[PDB]
């Protein structure tokens, strides 16, 4: 959709394969803090939160724990001790038009810094004086939702990168999303050590 009021999904009650995650071909950048990719493939959790969105290429460096910038200070801000990984794809074809793939309007005017995971979708007029632009014009009539103008002439740094961030919660965990090892046919008619689900 947009980095403005991003899209989310709460995965639970499944077997997290990961065989494609960070192993598909067109992935551009993937990096997690606290967890190794393979450990992730053997780690287990209670629930998962996926938060996908689209940002400008030159702003990918701002999606990081406590990282400071524009998109990470006034648009969408992730905690400082956030453990998990993000992945970003250069959608320089998937979301772009010579006419301007700016359907999405990122956030450029905010009253106060963001709390971690604070959806702040709003339609107001940041201003200086008494009234907003509904009754004033020129001075103090600013609107935080600015288009991107994604078009192909834009260089890489300004190509819409689609980014997806995974956050594993572990409080009180009747963990419903696991399963890295499930095979090997049983030997019969011989004294054998078996390990049936423990």
């Amino acid at each position, epitope marked *: 959709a947009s980095v403005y009021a991003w899209n989310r999904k709460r995965i639970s009650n499944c077997v997290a394969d990961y065989s494609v995650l960070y192993n598909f071909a067109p992935f551009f950048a993937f990096k997690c803090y606290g967890v190794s990719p393979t450990k992730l493939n053997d780690l287990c959790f209670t629930n998962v939160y996926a938060d996908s969105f689209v940002i400008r290429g*030159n702003e990918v460096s701002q999606i990081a724990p406590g990282q400071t910038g524009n998109i990470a200070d006034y648009n969408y801000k992730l905690p400082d001790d956030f453990t998990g990984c993000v992945i970003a794809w250069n959608s320089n074809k998937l979301d772009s038009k010579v006419g301007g793939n700016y359907n999405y309007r990122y956030r450029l005017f905010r009253k106060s810094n963001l709390k971690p995971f604070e959806r702040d979708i709003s339609t107001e007029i940041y201003q200086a004086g008494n009234k907003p632009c509904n009754g004033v014009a020129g001075v103090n009539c600013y609107f935080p939702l600015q288009s991107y103008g994604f078009r192909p002439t834009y260089g890489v740094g300004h190509q819409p990168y689609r980014v997806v961030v995974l956050s594993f919660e572990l409080l009180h965990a009747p963990a419903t999303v696991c399963g890295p090892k499930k095979s090997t046919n049983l030997v019969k008619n011989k004294c054998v050590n078996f390990n049936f689900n423990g």
Partner: antibody, heavy 118, light 109 residues
Framework: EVQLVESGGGLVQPGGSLRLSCAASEITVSRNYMSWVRQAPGKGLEWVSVMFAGGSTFYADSVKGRFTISRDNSKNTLYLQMNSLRAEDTAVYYC????????????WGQGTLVTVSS | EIVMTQSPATLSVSPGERATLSCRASQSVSSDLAWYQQKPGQAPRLLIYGASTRATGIPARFSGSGSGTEFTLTISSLQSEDSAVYYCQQYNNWPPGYTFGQGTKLEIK
């Protein structure tokens, strides 16, 4: 009228400190995107610093680690502390309110010269 | 860090005629620009931002153009007071950062 008036400009011996101040009128600063610019005699301009509306500030790389912006919100004014002024920092400093895509920097300050002993 | 180069350096044109000023970029600046006229003695003044949008008040006599790595400002009829320095400011990277040009000296007769 809408304006930005500056202070702190002067002369100081190398390694010394200084503090630049920026006052405004008929317009607020606490809730306004602020940007300090400077100009060496005869050359172009360069963005020096910025303070946001939440407090998270930023500085250029050439002056990173040495200058610190602050603002007395109570009386609608901006400040920039400088230290260890070397031969480069001799310049005229300007105060600016930059909006960006919705109108680029417009209202500026008369400027203020800041030179060093030599 | 896109380095901008203005051209020409100086210009002396008879009153009443047209004037053409070029501003040259080193990378893709699409339509992120602005033009400032810094009359000698005080801060600059914005004339034309983005690609060609005329800043409020700014006489229609000015016209900006160009995109990519090359931009141009054009003046219809220079009056005696148009003599000043002009700078093309780009902002393809708004998040605190900016990079200016070398300036152009325009005079009359």
């Amino acid at each position: 009228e809408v304006q930005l008036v500056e202070s702190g400009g002067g002369l100081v011996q190398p390694g010394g400190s200084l503090r630049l101040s920026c006052a405004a009128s008929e317009i607020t600063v606490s809730r306004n995107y602020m940007s300090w610019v400077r100009q060496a005699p005869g050359k172009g301009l360069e963005w020096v610093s910025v303070m946001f509306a939440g407090g998270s500030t930023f500085y250029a790389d050439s002056v990173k680690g040495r200058f610190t912006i602050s603002r007395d919100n109570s009386k609608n004014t901006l400040y920039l502390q400088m230290n260890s002024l070397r031969a480069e920092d001799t310049a005229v400093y300007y105060c600016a309110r930059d909006l960006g895509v919705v109108g680029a920097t417009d209202y500026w300050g008369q400027g203020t010269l800041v030179t060093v002993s030599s | 860090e896109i380095v901008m180069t203005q051209s020409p350096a100086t210009l002396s044109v008879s009153p009443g005629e047209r004037a053409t000023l070029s501003c040259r970029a080193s990378q893709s600046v699409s339509s992120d620009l602005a033009w400032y006229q810094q009359k000698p003695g005080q801060a600059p003044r914005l004339l034309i931002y983005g690609a060609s949008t005329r800043a409020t008040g700014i006489p229609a006599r000015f016209s900006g153009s160009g995109s990519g790595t090359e931009f141009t400002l054009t003046i219809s009829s220079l009056q005696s007071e148009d003599s000043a320095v002009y700078y093309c400011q780009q902002y393809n990277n708004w998040p605190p950062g900016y990079t200016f040009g070398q300036g152009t000296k325009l005079e009359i007769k």
